[PDB]
């Protein structure tokens, strides 16, 4: 599993990609608050950073792609 925060940010970006509408920290935050599911805020930041060019499929890697420790 992931952290529901990370995963929540994921989904906020997901809905955003369904209309492919503007990606802002406040946009993702709006999704966050709408569902009631909070994220590690650096994610909304970095998400708004990347998702304006990258794809949601990159989130599956999240610049690490680690499994065990």
């Amino acid at each position: 599993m992931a952290s529901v925060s990370e995963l929540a940010c994921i989904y906020s970006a997901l809905i955003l990609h369904d209309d492919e509408v503007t990606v802002t920290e406040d946009k993702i935050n709006a999704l966050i608050k709408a569902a009631g599911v909070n994220v590690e805020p650096f994610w909304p930041g970095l998400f708004a950073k990347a998702l304006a060019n990258v794809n949601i499929g990159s989130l599956i890697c999240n610049v690490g792609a680690g499994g065990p420790a």
């Binding site: 599993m1 992931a2 529901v4 995963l7 989904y11 369904d18 209309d19 709006a30 569902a35 009631g36």
Partner: protein, 70 residues
């Protein structure tokens, strides 16, 4: 590009672990994303009875409905 699956996941992640069409409208309404009240009730209809995290924990992409081409 995968429809209201993600909205469903959001709602289930931090509000209701069995989201409905109205919950979808909620989530997408907050950012002004348009939705058909049957389309989401349909995605939910499919989604209903799944373990959100585990679903996406190997599926951050191609959420439920994989992009329909043609």
């Amino acid at each position: 590009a995968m429809r209201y699956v993600a909205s469903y996941l959001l709602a289930a992640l931090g509000g209701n672990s069995s989201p409905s069409a109205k919950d979808i409208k909620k989530i997408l309404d907050s950012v002004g994303i348009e939705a058909d009240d049957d389309r989401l009730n349909k995605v939910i209809s499919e989604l209903n009875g799944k373990n959100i995290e585990d679903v996406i924990a190997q599926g951050i992409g191609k959420l439920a409905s994989v992009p329909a081409g043609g």
